[PDB]
Ligand binder design. Structure first.
Ligand SMILES: [Zn+2]
Length: 476
């Protein structure tokens, strides 16, 4: 009857949005084994959490960490924020099941270089993960654009009916091997010509596996509401769980339209289970897209293969030095990465406050000067938006990165501090927790996190990332 660890006298948040409770938490093996008051229990290790808070480990529902978790199993960018589980395979791109011919078509470079895609089937990817495991648990979506690339040489078109049949069987096999569902990125060049009927062709497979559908909307600018109708039609037709990724209304035309996005959820019809996620910043980030170049707001170049000397500079400054328009400068900078300061802060606050919204970092792990969301998202929610701005309580903030997310993705026995659940846990100081990553110094680690456990083993303690490698692959 001894346990490995008891955490004494933390302010414990259960992850369900309830008021915190002062009590002790016992860990043995991978599991939370006792809650309440455990001075009469025998523990090898005793942690004094007086004055601190304990919460379930944070679940990053929107990552591009597919290959990063193999390259970098310590996962400092996420672990130092309190993240214990990552959801991979978003916006239509995944590491598996993928077989590459010529190149990795865009946006697969967000994941890694062509040579890294060594996983013809999902089980190859799970095998690779299990060589070292990682400091985070992994749950994987299958990317629709990745599936298209397996069967299409020319991506600038709808898939044929026969190519769709192949993709249906590839998704079915991947789901049987453990994938959670399918993601799309319908705004990207290499998926934009997929009609809604092509996406609908996956619905029966998803429904048969009780699997998920996540989507980067076909547009997030003027016609964003039309794009949301597309996502709801998947829920209407198949009664499956749908999640809209990084909800936003982008572009100067659309600042102030966040209430329209919220109200659009009233058009779901029969089922009302569509969810969404967001990152806590008023700026987006992706490979430089000529269609988004504007003088309406700041655009910052993060990398450029053509002109690396212009990295970490404002597009308007680059254009002035070069003596040409912003659009012509962008043409010469490609291929390049950018941070677009194209969102409105009041819109962001409304979308974060929305009770359907989970927290997702959308961190880009191959970016050499990344958007700071890669390193600051979850402490920014707890410290900036909860404590400082007062948009919501700490209990609400925690719920939106733990229990809400485990429920929506059906992650068994995670996201909640309850006896019998896994001991993914974060110990932190509520008054000091804060993001330090800025747009200029975008990899500064957060403050206020004292200790992190993944499946009962310490992966972070007193500013040290620790290679416990106790994460697991979470199969459906
Ligand atoms: Zn996206």
């Amino acid at each position: 009857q001894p346990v490995d660890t008891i955490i004494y006298q933390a302010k414990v948040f259960d992850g369900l949005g309830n008021a915190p409770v002062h009590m002790d938490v016992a860990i043995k093996g991978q599991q939370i084994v006792a809650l309440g008051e455990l001075s009469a229990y025998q523990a090898t290790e005793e942690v004094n959490a007086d004055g601190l808070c304990l919460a379930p480990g944070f679940i990053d529902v929107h990552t591009h960490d597919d290959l990063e978790v193999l390259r970098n199993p310590e996962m400092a960018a996420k672990i130092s924020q309190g993240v214990t589980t990552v959801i991979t395979g978003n916006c239509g791109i995944s590491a598996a099941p993928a077989e590459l011919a010529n190149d990795a078509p865009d946006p697969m470079n967000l994941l890694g270089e062509k040579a890294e895609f060594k996983f013809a089937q999902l089980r190859d990817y799970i095998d690779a993960y299990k060589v070292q495991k990682a400091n985070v648990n992994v749950a994987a979506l299958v990317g629709h654009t990745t599936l298209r690339n397996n069967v299409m040489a020319d991506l600038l078109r709808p898939a044929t009916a026969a190519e769709i049949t192949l993709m249906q069987q590839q998704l079915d096999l991947a789901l049987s091997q453990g994938a959670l569902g399918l993601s799309t990125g319908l705004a990207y060049k290499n998926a934009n010509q997929a009609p809604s009927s092509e996406v609908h062709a996956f619905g029966e497979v998803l429904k048969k596996h009780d699997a998920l559908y996540t989507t980067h909307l076909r547009t997030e600018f003027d016609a964003v509401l039309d794009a949301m109708d597309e996502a709801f039609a998947m829920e209407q037709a198949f009664d499956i769980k749908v999640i809209i990724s990084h909800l936003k209304c982008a572009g100067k035309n659309n600042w102030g339209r966040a209430p329209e996005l919220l109200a659009k959820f009233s058009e779901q019809g029969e089922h009302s289970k569509c969810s969404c996620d967001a990152y806590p910043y008023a700026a987006s980030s992706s490979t430089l897209d000529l269609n988004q170049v504007t003088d309406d707001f700041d655009i910052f170049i993060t990398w450029s293969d053509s002109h690396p000397e212009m990295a970490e500079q404002l597009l308007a400054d680059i254009a002035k030095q070069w003596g040409i328009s912003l659009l012509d400068a962008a043409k010469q900078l490609q291929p390049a990465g950018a941070v677009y300061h194209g969102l409105n802060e009041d819109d962001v606050k409304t979308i974060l406050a929305f009770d359907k919204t989970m927290i997702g970092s959308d961190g880009l792990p191959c970016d050499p000067h990344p958007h700071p969301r890669l390193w600051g998202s979850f402490p920014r929610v707890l410290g900036h938006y909860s404590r400082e701005q007062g948009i919501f309580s700490l209990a609400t903030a925690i719920h939106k990165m733990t229990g809400l997310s485990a429920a929506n993705y059906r992650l068994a026995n995670r996201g909640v501090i309850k006896v019998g659940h896994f001991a993914d846990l974060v110990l932190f100081d509520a008054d000091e927790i804060i993001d330090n990553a800025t747009f200029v110094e975008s990899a500064l680690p957060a403050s206020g996190i004292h200790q992190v456990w993944t499946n009962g083993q310490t992966t972070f303690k007193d500013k040290r990332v620790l290679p416990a490698y106790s994460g697991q692959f979470l199969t459906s």
